[PDB]
Automatic annotation (TrEMBL):
UniProt KW Signal keyword: yes
Entry keywords, A to Z: Signal
Covered residues, full protein: 21 to 52 of 52
Record's protein name: Chemokine
The organism of origin for this protein: Mythimna separata
Disulfide bonds, paired cysteine numbers: C7-C19
Length: 32
């Protein structure tokens, strides 16, 4: 993993090359 980018656990790499980090919008809570 010797590089400037580096995509450890959580960063999913795509076939194109871009790295999609786990930043997807989860289920909108409801306070209570």
């Amino acid at each position: 993993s010797v590089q400037i980018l580096r995509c450890p656990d959580g960063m999913q790499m795509l076939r194109s090359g871009q790295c999609v980090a786990t930043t997807e919008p989860p289920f909108d809570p409801d306070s209570y």
